[PDB]
């Protein structure tokens, strides 16, 4: 689709239209501090094209916003390559938010979820997070309306054993949380329950097909999900493959190469040879 940069959206909602054609945000997305906004600015607004965030997602003090079901309906993976504190999703002092509605979110690789101080917010205990996050031990969901034992939560849907009882799992009144059979793992499945291809991540339009993933599990290159970037391609942003040329062009006006990865910085013990961008170990001590 489109790959755009990590963005930081504040004050006027109008900045939000930068994302219109975007499919993957390479980096993080932060939408915050909007105090004059009203429900009606959101009841006609959507980003069905956003499928993936590489780093983290953070919503904070966005008023008038009541569900995310129309805003990011098709966001499916958050990869958490870089985290906010230790979180890959932060929902914080989101006054007005009632329900989450990320019914397409299937996996948060790496990070944890922190959803705090959201009076109004329910449909939280109706989510099985362990089907989405690797580590839920570090989840931090407190001080929401859900913690008043007094939530009008209603959903068909399936139940998991999180307590000492099974619990129906859904995002909104009209969307179930999708659960793939245990043995599909993270790879996703069709509505019937045929596992997607093993190099796919959350979902697929067709089964058994590495070009028909909705979000690559390992790395993306030339339409296909692959296990690893072959030379002459390099690991970038830890989700996609690129050639030397791409990596170089970005460096010049601070990207470098090491371990067959294209990265901002040489790691310790290494200095950057100028002829080839390749990090080399130091002759004696490293000035760096």
């Amino acid at each position: 689709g489109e790959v755009c940069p990590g963005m930081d959206i504040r004050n006027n909602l109008t900045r939000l239209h930068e994302l219109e054609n975007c499919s993957v945000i390479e980096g993080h997305l932060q939408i915050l501090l909007m105090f004059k906004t009203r429900p009606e600015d959101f009841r006609d607004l959507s980003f069905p094209k956003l499928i993936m965030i590489t780093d983290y997602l953070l919503l904070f003090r966005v008023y008038g916003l009541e569900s995310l079901k129309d805003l990011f309906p098709n966001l499916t993976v958050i990869r958490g390559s870089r985290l906010f504190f230790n979180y890959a999703l932060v929902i914080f002092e989101m006054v007005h938010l009632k329900e989450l509605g990320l019914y397409n979110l299937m996996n948060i690789t790496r990070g944890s979820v922190r959803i705090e101080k959201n009076n109004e917010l329910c449909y939280l205990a109706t989510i099985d997070w362990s089907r989405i996050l690797d580590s839920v031990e570090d989840n931090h969901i407190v001080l929401n309306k859900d913690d008043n034992e007094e939530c009008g939560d209603i959903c068909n849907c399936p139940a998991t054993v999180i307590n000492g009882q099974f619990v129906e799992r859904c995002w909104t009144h009209s969307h179930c949380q999708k659960v793939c059979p245990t043995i599909c793992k993270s790879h996703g499945c069709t509505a019937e329950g045929l596992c997607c291809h093993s190099e796919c991540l959350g979902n697929c339009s067709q089964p058994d097909d590495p070009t028909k993933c909705v979000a690559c599990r390992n790395f993306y290159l030339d339409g296909r999900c692959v296990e690893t970037c072959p030379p002459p391609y390099y690991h970038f942003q830890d989700w996609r493959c690129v050639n030397f040329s791409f990596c170089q062009d970005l460096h010049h006006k601070q990207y470098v190469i090491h371990n067959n990865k294209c990265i901002p910085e040489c790691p310790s013990g290494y200095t950057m040879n100028s002829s080839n961008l390749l990090c080399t170990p130091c002759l004696g001590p490293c000035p760096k």
Epitope: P210, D222, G223, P231
Partner: antibody, heavy 116, light 113 residues
Framework: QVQLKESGPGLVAPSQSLSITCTVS????????VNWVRQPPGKGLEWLGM???????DYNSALKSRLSISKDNSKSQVFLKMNSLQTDDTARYYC????????????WGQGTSVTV | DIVMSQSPSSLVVSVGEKVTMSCKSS????????????LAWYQQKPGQSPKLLIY???TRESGVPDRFTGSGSGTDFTLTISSVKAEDLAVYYC????????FGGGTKLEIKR
């Protein structure tokens, strides 16, 4: 339905060029690589070249521009074109698929015989 | 392209036994970024086109029996067939797919009667 089938002319007189069409079906050429390998009867299997998803090309250095590999992805065809052949080029030619990132060479053609 | 060399040119064996043939490259084939070696083994039952067996020198392809066992790392490789069954007769080749691809000189399996 992953399939490759080679269309060779079969017979070529010396000093003339070789044009083979590998017709693949069941996958998109924009997303996989295609290799060419030949074998003279009961002799070695010989890597000739490959064309990646993005149009990029690899050739055996032995082939001094004797080899040109190009593609028509809209009509699912891969073209090998090799100039001025001699009798030591008498071999069976295969194209085979290449899931580069994830696999090496899965799915082979049945092979086409070419004699000089 | 680099240069690959096998041994032997051919071998012979009978039913029940384990078998190991060799290969070598002029340059190291271990990929740093994932710790996998970029080498393949293919079986070619004779007269028919070859078939994919083992990639990353240890990953078994779908539809391959567990009797087939790939080994080695760096520049030096070997392929192992544990317990021979009748039609296991084939010529086996090593392919590097690290940079470009080149195949080994190949090595033949024959059976005793």
């Amino acid at each position: 339905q992953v399939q490759l089938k080679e269309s060779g002319p079969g017979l070529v007189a010396p000093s003339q060029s070789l044009s083979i069409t590998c017709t693949v079906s069941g996958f998109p050429l924009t997303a996989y690589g295609v290799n060419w390998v030949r074998q003279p009867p009961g002799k070695g299997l010989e890597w000739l070249g490959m064309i990646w998803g993005d149009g990029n090309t690899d050739y055996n250095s032995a082939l001094k521009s004797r080899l040109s590999i190009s593609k028509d992805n809209s009509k699912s065809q891969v073209f090998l074109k090799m100039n001025s052949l001699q009798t030591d080029d008498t071999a069976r030619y295969y194209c085979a698929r290449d899931p580069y990132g994830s696999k090496p060479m899965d799915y082979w053609g049945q092979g086409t015989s070419v004699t000089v | 392209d680099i240069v690959m060399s096998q041994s032997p040119s051919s071998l012979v064996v009978s039913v029940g036994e384990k078998v190991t043939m060799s290969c070598k490259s002029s340059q190291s084939l271990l990929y740093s970024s994932n710790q996998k070696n970029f080498l393949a083994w293919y079986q070619q039952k004779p007269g028919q086109s070859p078939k994919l067996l083992i990639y990353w020198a240890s990953t078994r392809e779908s539809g391959v029996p567990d009797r087939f066992t790939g080994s080695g790392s760096g520049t030096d490789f070997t392929l192992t067939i544990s317990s021979v069954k009748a039609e296991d007769l084939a010529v086996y080749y090593c392919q590097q797919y690290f940079r470009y691809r080149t195949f080994g000189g190949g090595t033949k399996l024959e059976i005793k009667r």
